[PDB]
Each structure stands twice: as structure tokens, then as C-alpha cells.
């Protein structure tokens, strides 16, 4: 129950390649990693590897470096049913969906009893995540599904300026008026 | 194309006369409340609108909810404002909850509407979706406190929307709400309950007070106190050891010198025990009220609103009974934001007060809430009804602080110097019958009598003798020692004790036969009086509701089936009429 050795052995090697430059392999071991059998007791991990990966793939390369999974540029799940990524947007999009519907289980529900720092922790990896999921649906101007998404998350705004700006911002995009108008008097 | 405007125009004036018969049915419901038959009005407009009731009372559970669509399309309040007038059918209620859930935006009328949504399911607590109840303006504060009971599951943003709520009233309110509050922290599984009462502490200084009054004596479950409660005792300990030492300076101050006075004046009674009956212990208790010197600044409990000026070191006078004795006040009346800012830098008349050890003073607390809403009801409909809703505050395991009426004088002390009926009594004291000041007596005690026995019969109450009824000068009659409730009832239940007690005397008052003008006044006024208390029926059920895990003997775990059935909510207002009516008379000999 005390993973140790795995994660330093495979990311420190591919963080000597960025330190050196070889991103392409980075993102072979990033790839073989995600679409190996999950592993219940390494979720956080793959939520790491996730972030990392959404982190780097939106700002790092161009439409023409992009290649897909089963091709160069144990068991594995597989099948002719499965959702095959085709673009860089698709399985950005994919994985920071998935990242979000799991992390929104970890959530600690913000307690506050007498400590903050679990929730403070959980608090940014929402933000941030949040964050990377409005910047990449931004572009694309679909502003209705990113209302939708700020909505979903508004269980634990409680006395934040930011999630509740980002969201009455968002709904005027979309066309809604009196829920903005409320939103903007809050 | 004519069919269409027909139809159109034929279903609006379906509804609307449907509207009106049941709007002139209750406004002739609420003319004359007995049958009184030489009043009369129109004939044939009375057996129309009996004839349509008839036709339309038989539908179906088609052809009505349809009409609910057709209300939805005229106006969203029109519909929101159907239930009201009431419908014996349930699928009105799911229409209206179906309609409300697929778009919430088109309402925003908060003291109805909101519990068409909040309520997704009662106890099946699933589907988290689509709420957002972070828009609707504030409502009573009974209602918000609901989401914290046994009612409904815990959810964050109930929760939210109910710590919300509560931060929108001056403190007077929440002061007049203390004791729900304190007992929500119980199935507080979560702690915003107890954020909210930091944050009120530090911002009122009242408001503290009467918390660590409050909470000092819940600690513990008996009377004299040795078991402390296995539940919230702990976290309850906590929270007095951190509120206290918080603040500093003038509040400091102005805190310790209360509580020291408190304590000073409260261990008299410790004291005098010990000395037996007698000229000894009434000296004694004179000479340690004497000991105790008047300090500026202090208030009584009982009376937040009011400042102390000396204390009348010869008014010392033990009672029978535990040594609990009685002491008299002059004070000024000044006011609460006034006097909390007065009592940071330093119309008179007299109070007495009682103080007693060893007994509760809870359920005395919330049948005097109980009685103070149902007197702000009746003033707010414009009747005439009188109660007296004296103040009683528990600061300790057993002890309480306990208000006198001014001119105290019971019944049973009159009673032993005449051994006559009151009748007697009040021609004497007034004179013949037909004098003038003979009729505002009767009146009076009509308009005391009225409102009494209803609430009697409301609350059911139980042992009430001659020695707990008081009488005023002017001639109305106050119940006191409201110990047994509800379910509690001395001698074994053995329940031969009538709803209303009716003695000959008492109905000779009023002319002594069923028939006499006086007779037909209270029994309107009665009649009147129930049938304007009845839409109030959800704030009670959610007072009573939060207090049922104190253990008290009174409550045995059917109190709420049975008191939600007395109300009658499935029944018109002639039948409740009829209903009152009959139960009223069966109690008569």
C-alpha cells in the first residue's frame, strides 16, 4: 500500500528529458501510463499525471506536431467501441473532464471545524482545474456547456469573489439575464 | 375561425365562476358563524352557487390537472396562488411542484413558492441537480431553521441558504429565538450553526449573555445535575471556554460586574436554607439582602430592557416549598439599543420577582412563546383577545429567574376567605348587575374566557384547579403552572377531566342559560378565534418539532400526529366551523 519507488523512477527520468529536452518521449511514457488498467489505490496519481498533461498540451506544440495514440510519431484497455482521440482539443477536453467528475468526489466538503488546510488544498486543485477547463472551452465559443460547468461547481463557493465573478461573467455570454442580474447584485 | 375564440373564452369563464363560488362561499362562511336563521339573503343565488359547487366537486383526477395548465399560461402567480384556495385532491400539488421544477425562474415570491422546490424529496435524499437557491429573498425564520431538524437530510446548500437567511434580522429576533438555536448544533453534523453564533457574539453583547445563559444549565440532563449529556456536552463545553476570554475591555468589564451581582443576589437562597421555619430564617434572609449593595450598570435577566436603580431591603418573603423566596425592585425602563450603549460607560415603577432552585423552567418557556405568537396572530387579524405573556428566563441547572404579575391575587386565597362563588365576590366588589361598570367586567372576562379556553383546548392541558387560575382588578382570569402538557396528565390519565372546564358559577356569570346574548358573544368569538389561527400551522409544527430531543417526560413520540390532526388542514371553513362548534358544546355539562 506504499507506492515509492514507481513514481520516482518514471517521472524523474522523464523530468531529466524535459530538463534535457526530449518532450516527445515524455509524452509516449504520458500516454502508456494514462491508457494502462487503473489502479484504485494510484488515483491521486492519475489525477497528477492528468493535470500534468492538460497542464503541458494546450501551450506546448502546434496543430501539425500532433499524433495520435496508436500510432509512433500488461494488460491495456482496448476494443472497436471505444472513443478514439483525434484532435489535441478532444482529449484535452476528455481528460479534464474526467479529472473534474473525479475530484469532485475527493472534495472535503469544505469543513472548516477547526482546520483549513485539507480544504485549502482541495480549493486550489478546483480552481486550477476549473481553470484550465474555462481556458480551453474559451476559444472554441461554446459559452452555454461552460455556464453549465461553472454552475456544477458552485457548491463550494461560500465567500469567494472569484468563482462567482467567473460565473456571472460567463452567464451574460451565453444570454441569460435575469440569473446575471442577480449574480451581478451579489 | 370562431371554435377557437369560443373555447378560449368558455374555459376563463368556467374557471373564474368557479373562483367566485368559492370566494362568496367563504366571505358567507365568515358573515355569521352559527347557523343563525332569522339572517338571510338571496335565495336563488344561493342555490346556484350550491348547484355549480355540486357539479364541479365531482371531477375526476383528469380535467383538473389540465386546469392547471391553463392557470400556468395565464400567469405563473395565479397559479402558485391555487393551492390556497383550497382543492381535497393531492394531484394538484404534483402538477404545481412538475410545473415549478422544470423552470424555477418564473417565481420569486418567497412565503409559498419556495417549498414547492426545496423539498426534491423528503427523506429519499438523491437527485442533486438544478438547485440554485442562492436568489430568493429572505422568509421567517422558522421556516429557514427547518432544514437543520429531522425533516429533511443535511445539504450544503440548504444549509447555506439557511445561514444565510438568519443574517438579515436586527438582534432582537434572534434574541427571541435563543432557545431553537442552541438545540440545531445537535444534528449539526455540519458546523455552520456554529460559525453563525461566533459571528453573532462578536458582533451584539447581549446576545452573548443570554447564550452562556442559556447553555450553562443544558449541560447537564437532571436537576441537581451529575450526567452530563454523552452528545454535544463536549462540544458544548468548548464552545463556552472559547467564547469567554474573547472579549476584553469595556464589554470585560461590564460582563464580570453582571455576573458577579448575579451571583451575589443568587446565593441568598443557598444560604437561608438551613434555618428552619420562622422569624429567624425571614431575618436572616432580610440581613444577607441587606449584605448585597446596588450596583449601576445591572439589569435584571428576565427583563433585558429595563435597568435596575435599588433594591427595597424589606420586601424579603420566603414561600412554602429548596428555600425559594421572593423579593421586590424599582426600576427604569429605557429601552435595548440604548441601554446596551449605556451600559458601556457606566417611567420608573416596581417589579417583583421569584426566584426558585431544583426545578426546570423550559417547558413554561416554550408554552409562553406559543402564547406570544398566538397574541401577536390575534392582534395582527384585529379581534379582541386578551392573554398576558409573562417573561420567565433559566440561567442554571434547576434555578431560573421567574416575573410577578403586578397585583398579584389568587384564586385560591379568595376562595378560602369567602367559600362562596365568584359571583358573590364580583356583586360585591362591583355592585348589582345593572350597573355600568358590571358589563365591562363581564366583557372583559368574556374576552379573557375566549381566548383561554381555546388555547386550553389547543395545547392540551391538564390539572387545572381552582389554585392556579388568577384574577386581575379589572376582572380577566391568567393560567399559571403550565408543568403538565401534551401528553403528561396527574392521577394516572385517568382523563375524565374535561377539554374545557365549565363550572356552574362561571356560566351563571354570563347569565347562567345557553340562550342568553353573552353566550352567543363568546361563542362567536371562540368560533372567529379558530378559525384565524388555523393557516399558522407550519411555524408551530416547526417549534415544537426541534425540541423533541431534550427527553422531557412530557413528550412520548406521537405528539406530532396528534397535534397536526387537531388543526383539521382537509377541511372547509364551514365544516371546521361546524366542527368547533360541536366540540365546544360537548364539554357544556
Redesign the interface.
Given at each position: 500500500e506504499l507506492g515509492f519507488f514507481l513514481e520516482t523512477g518514471l517521472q524523474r527520468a522523464h523530468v531529466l528529458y524535459f530538463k534535457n529536452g526530449n518532450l516527445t518521449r515524455g509524452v509516449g511514457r504520458f500516454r502508456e501510463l494514462l491508457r494502462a488498467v487503473e489502479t484504485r489505490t494510484t488515483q491521486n496519481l492519475r489525477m497528477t499525471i492528468a493535470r500534468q498533461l492538460a497542464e503541458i498540451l494546450l501551450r506546448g506544440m502546434c496543430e501539425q506536431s500532433y499524433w495520435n495514440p496508436l500510432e509512433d510519431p500488461a494488460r491495456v484497455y482496448s476494443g472497436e467501441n471505444i472513443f478514439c482521440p483525434q484532435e489535441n482539443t478532444e482529449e484535452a477536453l476528455l481528460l479534464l473532464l474526467i479529472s473534474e467528475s473525479m475530484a469532485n468526489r475527493d472534495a472535503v466538503?469544505?469543513?472548516?471545524?477547526e482546520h483549513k488546510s485539507d480544504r485549502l488544498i482541495s480549493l486550489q486543485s478546483a480552481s486550477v482545474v476549473y481553470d484550465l477547463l474555462t481556458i480551453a472551452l474559451g476559444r472554441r465559443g461554446q459559452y452555454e456547456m461552460l455556464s453549465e460547468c461553472l454552475?456544477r461547481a458552485?457548491?463550494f463557493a461560500?465567500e469567494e469573489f472569484h468563482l462567482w465573478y467567473q460565473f456571472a461573467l460567463s452567464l451574460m455570454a451565453a444570454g441569460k439575464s435575469?440569473?446575471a442580474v442577480?449574480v451581478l447584485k451579489? | 375561425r370562431g371554435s377557437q375564440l369560443h373555447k378560449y373564452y368558455m374555459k376563463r369563464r368556467t374557471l373564474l365562476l368557479s373562483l367566485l363560488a368559492t370566494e362568496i362561499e367563504r366571505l358567507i362562511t365568515w358573515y355569521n358563524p352559527l347557523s343563525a336563521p332569522e339572517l338571510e339573503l338571496d335565495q336563488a343565488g344561493e342555490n346556484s352557487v350550491a348547484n355549480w359547487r355540486s357539479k364541479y366537486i365531482s371531477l375526476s383526477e383528469k380535467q383538473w390537472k389540465d386546469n392547471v395548465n391553463l392557470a400556468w399560461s395565464i400567469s405563473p402567480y395565479l397559479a402558485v396562488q391555487l393551492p390556497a384556495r383550497f382543492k381535497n385532491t393531492e394531484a394538484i400539488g404534483n402538477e404545481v411542484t412538475r410545473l415549478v421544477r422544470l423552470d424555477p425562474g418564473a417565481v420569486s415570491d418567497v412565503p409559498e413558492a419556495i417549498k414547492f422546490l426545496v423539498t426534491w424529496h423528503t427523506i429519499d435524499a438523491d437527485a442533486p441537480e438544478l438547485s440554485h437557491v442562492l436568489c430568493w429573498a429572505p422568509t421567517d425564520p422558522p421556516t429557514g431553521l427547518s432544514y437543520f431538524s429531522s425533516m429533511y437530510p443535511p445539504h450544503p446548500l440548504t444549509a447555506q441558504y439557511g445561514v444565510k437567511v438568519l443574517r438579515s434580522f436586527p438582534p432582537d429576533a434572534i434574541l427571541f429565538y435563543i432557545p431553537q438555536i442552541v438545540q440545531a448544533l445537535r444534528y449539526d453534523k455540519m458546523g455552520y450553526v456554529r460559525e453563525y453564533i461566533l459571528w453573532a457574539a462578536s458582533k451584539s453583547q447581549l446576545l452573548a449573555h443570554q447564550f452562556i445563559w442559556n447553555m450553562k444549565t443544558n449541560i447537564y440532563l437532571d436537576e441537581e445535575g451529575h450526567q452530563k449529556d454523552p452528545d454535544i456536552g463536549d462540544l458544548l463545553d468548548q464552545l463556552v471556554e472559547e467564547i469567554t476570554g474573547s472579549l476584553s475591555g469595556p464589554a470585560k468589564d461590564f460582563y464580570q460586574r453582571e455576573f458577579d451581582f448575579f451571583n451575589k443576589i443568587t446565593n441568598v437562597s443557598a444560604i437561608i436554607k438551613p434555618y428552619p421555619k420562622g422569624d429567624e430564617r425571614k431575618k436572616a434572609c432580610l440581613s444577607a439582602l441587606s449584605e448585597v449593595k446596588v450596583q449601576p450598570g445591572c439589569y435584571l435577566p428576565s427583563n433585558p430592557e429595563a435597568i435596575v436603580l435599588d433594591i427595597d431591603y424589606k420586601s424579603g418573603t420566603p414561600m412554602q416549598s429548596k428555600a425559594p423566596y421572593l423579593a421586590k425592585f424599582k426600576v427604569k425602563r429605557c429601552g435595548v439599543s440604548e441601554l446596551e450603549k449605556e451600559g458601556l460607560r457606566c417611567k420608573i415603577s416596581w417589579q417583583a420577582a421569584i426566584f426558585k432552585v431544583g426545578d426546570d423552567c423550559r417547558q413554561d418557556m416554550l408554552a409562553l412563546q406559543i402564547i406570544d405568537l398566538f397574541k401577536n396572530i390575534f392582534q395582527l387579524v384585529g379581534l379582541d383577545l386578551f392573554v398576558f405573556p409573562y417573561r420567565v428566563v433559566a440561567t442554571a441547572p434547576g434555578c431560573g429567574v421567574i416575573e410577578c404579575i403586578p397585583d398579584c391575587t389568587s384564586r385560591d386565597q379568595l376562595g378560602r376567605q369567602t367559600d362562596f362563588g365568584m359571583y358573590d365576590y364580583f356583586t360585591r366588589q362591583y355592585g348589582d348587575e345593572s350597573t355600568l361598570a358590571f358589563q365591562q367586567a363581564r366583557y372583559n372576562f368574556i374576552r379573557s374566557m375566549a381566548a383561554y379556553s381555546l388555547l386550553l383546548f389547543l395545547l392540551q392541558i391538564k390539572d387545572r384547579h381552582n389554585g392556579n387560575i388568577m384574577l386581575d382588578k379589572k376582572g380577566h382570569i391568567i393560567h399559571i403552572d403550565f408543568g403538565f402538557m401534551f401528553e403528561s396528565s396527574p392521577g394516572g390519565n385517568l382523563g375524565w377531566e374535561p377539554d374545557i372546564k365549565l363550572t356552574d358559577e362561571m356560566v351563571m356569570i354570563m347569565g347562567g342559560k345557553m340562550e342568553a346574548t353573552p353566550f352567543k358573544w363568546f361563542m362567536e368569538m371562540c368560533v372567529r378565534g379558530y378559525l384565524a389561527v388555523r393557516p399558522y400551522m407550519d411555524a408551530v409544527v416547526s417549534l415544537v418539532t426541534l425540541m423533541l430531543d431534550t427527553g422531557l417526560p412530557c413528550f412520548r413520540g406521537q405528539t406530532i400526529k396528534l397535534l397536526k390532526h387537531r388543526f383539521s388542514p382537509n377541511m372547509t371553513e364551514r365544516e371546521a366551523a361546524n366542527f368547533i362548534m360541536k366540540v365546544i358544546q360537548s364539554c357544556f355539562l
Amino acid at each position: 500500500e506504499l507506492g515509492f519507488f514507481l513514481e520516482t523512477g518514471l517521472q524523474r527520468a522523464h523530468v531529466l528529458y524535459f530538463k534535457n529536452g526530449n518532450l516527445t518521449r515524455g509524452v509516449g511514457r504520458f500516454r502508456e501510463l494514462l491508457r494502462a488498467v487503473e489502479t484504485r489505490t494510484t488515483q491521486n496519481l492519475r489525477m497528477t499525471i492528468a493535470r500534468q498533461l492538460a497542464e503541458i498540451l494546450l501551450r506546448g506544440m502546434c496543430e501539425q506536431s500532433y499524433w495520435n495514440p496508436l500510432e509512433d510519431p500488461a494488460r491495456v484497455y482496448s476494443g472497436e467501441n471505444i472513443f478514439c482521440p483525434q484532435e489535441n482539443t478532444e482529449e484535452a477536453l476528455l481528460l479534464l473532464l474526467i479529472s473534474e467528475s473525479m475530484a469532485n468526489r475527493d472534495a472535503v466538503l469544505s469543513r472548516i471545524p477547526e482546520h483549513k488546510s485539507d480544504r485549502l488544498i482541495s480549493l486550489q486543485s478546483a480552481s486550477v482545474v476549473y481553470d484550465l477547463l474555462t481556458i480551453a472551452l474559451g476559444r472554441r465559443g461554446q459559452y452555454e456547456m461552460l455556464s453549465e460547468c461553472l454552475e456544477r461547481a458552485m457548491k463550494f463557493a461560500f465567500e469567494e469573489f472569484h468563482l462567482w465573478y467567473q460565473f456571472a461573467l460567463s452567464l451574460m455570454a451565453a444570454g441569460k439575464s435575469a440569473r446575471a442580474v442577480k449574480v451581478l447584485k451579489e | 375561425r370562431g371554435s377557437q375564440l369560443h373555447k378560449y373564452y368558455m374555459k376563463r369563464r368556467t374557471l373564474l365562476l368557479s373562483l367566485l363560488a368559492t370566494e362568496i362561499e367563504r366571505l358567507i362562511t365568515w358573515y355569521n358563524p352559527l347557523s343563525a336563521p332569522e339572517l338571510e339573503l338571496d335565495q336563488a343565488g344561493e342555490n346556484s352557487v350550491a348547484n355549480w359547487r355540486s357539479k364541479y366537486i365531482s371531477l375526476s383526477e383528469k380535467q383538473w390537472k389540465d386546469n392547471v395548465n391553463l392557470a400556468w399560461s395565464i400567469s405563473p402567480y395565479l397559479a402558485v396562488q391555487l393551492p390556497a384556495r383550497f382543492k381535497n385532491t393531492e394531484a394538484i400539488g404534483n402538477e404545481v411542484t412538475r410545473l415549478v421544477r422544470l423552470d424555477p425562474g418564473a417565481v420569486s415570491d418567497v412565503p409559498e413558492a419556495i417549498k414547492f422546490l426545496v423539498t426534491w424529496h423528503t427523506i429519499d435524499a438523491d437527485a442533486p441537480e438544478l438547485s440554485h437557491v442562492l436568489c430568493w429573498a429572505p422568509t421567517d425564520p422558522p421556516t429557514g431553521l427547518s432544514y437543520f431538524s429531522s425533516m429533511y437530510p443535511p445539504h450544503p446548500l440548504t444549509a447555506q441558504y439557511g445561514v444565510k437567511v438568519l443574517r438579515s434580522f436586527p438582534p432582537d429576533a434572534i434574541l427571541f429565538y435563543i432557545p431553537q438555536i442552541v438545540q440545531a448544533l445537535r444534528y449539526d453534523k455540519m458546523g455552520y450553526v456554529r460559525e453563525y453564533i461566533l459571528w453573532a457574539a462578536s458582533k451584539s453583547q447581549l446576545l452573548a449573555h443570554q447564550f452562556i445563559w442559556n447553555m450553562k444549565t443544558n449541560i447537564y440532563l437532571d436537576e441537581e445535575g451529575h450526567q452530563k449529556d454523552p452528545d454535544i456536552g463536549d462540544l458544548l463545553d468548548q464552545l463556552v471556554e472559547e467564547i469567554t476570554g474573547s472579549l476584553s475591555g469595556p464589554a470585560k468589564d461590564f460582563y464580570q460586574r453582571e455576573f458577579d451581582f448575579f451571583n451575589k443576589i443568587t446565593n441568598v437562597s443557598a444560604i437561608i436554607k438551613p434555618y428552619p421555619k420562622g422569624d429567624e430564617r425571614k431575618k436572616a434572609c432580610l440581613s444577607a439582602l441587606s449584605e448585597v449593595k446596588v450596583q449601576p450598570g445591572c439589569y435584571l435577566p428576565s427583563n433585558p430592557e429595563a435597568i435596575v436603580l435599588d433594591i427595597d431591603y424589606k420586601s424579603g418573603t420566603p414561600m412554602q416549598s429548596k428555600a425559594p423566596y421572593l423579593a421586590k425592585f424599582k426600576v427604569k425602563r429605557c429601552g435595548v439599543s440604548e441601554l446596551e450603549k449605556e451600559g458601556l460607560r457606566c417611567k420608573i415603577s416596581w417589579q417583583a420577582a421569584i426566584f426558585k432552585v431544583g426545578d426546570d423552567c423550559r417547558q413554561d418557556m416554550l408554552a409562553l412563546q406559543i402564547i406570544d405568537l398566538f397574541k401577536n396572530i390575534f392582534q395582527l387579524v384585529g379581534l379582541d383577545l386578551f392573554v398576558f405573556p409573562y417573561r420567565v428566563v433559566a440561567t442554571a441547572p434547576g434555578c431560573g429567574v421567574i416575573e410577578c404579575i403586578p397585583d398579584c391575587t389568587s384564586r385560591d386565597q379568595l376562595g378560602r376567605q369567602t367559600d362562596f362563588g365568584m359571583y358573590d365576590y364580583f356583586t360585591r366588589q362591583y355592585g348589582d348587575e345593572s350597573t355600568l361598570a358590571f358589563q365591562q367586567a363581564r366583557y372583559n372576562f368574556i374576552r379573557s374566557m375566549a381566548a383561554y379556553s381555546l388555547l386550553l383546548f389547543l395545547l392540551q392541558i391538564k390539572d387545572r384547579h381552582n389554585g392556579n387560575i388568577m384574577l386581575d382588578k379589572k376582572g380577566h382570569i391568567i393560567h399559571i403552572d403550565f408543568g403538565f402538557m401534551f401528553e403528561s396528565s396527574p392521577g394516572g390519565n385517568l382523563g375524565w377531566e374535561p377539554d374545557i372546564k365549565l363550572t356552574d358559577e362561571m356560566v351563571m356569570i354570563m347569565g347562567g342559560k345557553m340562550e342568553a346574548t353573552p353566550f352567543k358573544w363568546f361563542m362567536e368569538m371562540c368560533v372567529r378565534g379558530y378559525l384565524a389561527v388555523r393557516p399558522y400551522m407550519d411555524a408551530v409544527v416547526s417549534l415544537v418539532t426541534l425540541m423533541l430531543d431534550t427527553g422531557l417526560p412530557c413528550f412520548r413520540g406521537q405528539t406530532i400526529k396528534l397535534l397536526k390532526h387537531r388543526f383539521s388542514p382537509n377541511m372547509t371553513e364551514r365544516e371546521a366551523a361546524n366542527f368547533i362548534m360541536k366540540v365546544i358544546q360537548s364539554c357544556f355539562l
